[PDB]
């Protein structure tokens, strides 16, 4: 069986990785100005439909950071 991430598993990873960073499903990757014809895909069609890498979860994670003692 293939290894994919869908449902709570997908949301769990984003929440477990990004957490309070605020992950986004739709984000640029190639070019959204010169190319007109383009389908809608981000983390679902990329990892749910196809087998991706967990490292991608970090990309969606925002640059901001919550509060912590240091």
């Amino acid at each position: 069986g293939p290894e994919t991430l869908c449902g709570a598993e997908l949301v769990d990873a984003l929440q477990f990785v990004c957490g309070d960073r605020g992950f986004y499903f739709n984000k640029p990757t190639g070019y959204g100005s010169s190319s007109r014809r383009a389908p809608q895909t981000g983390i679902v069609d990329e990892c749910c439909f196809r087998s991706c890498d967990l490292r991608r979860l970090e990309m969606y994670c925002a640059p901001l950071k919550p509060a912590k003692s240091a």
């Binding site: 290894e3 994919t4 598993e9 477990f16 087998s51 967990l54 979860l57």
Partner: peptide
Amino acid sequence: RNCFESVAALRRCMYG
């Protein structure tokens, strides 16, 4: 070991 290796690793890592 590394958590970001497979789809299963993520579950085991979190579900602990």
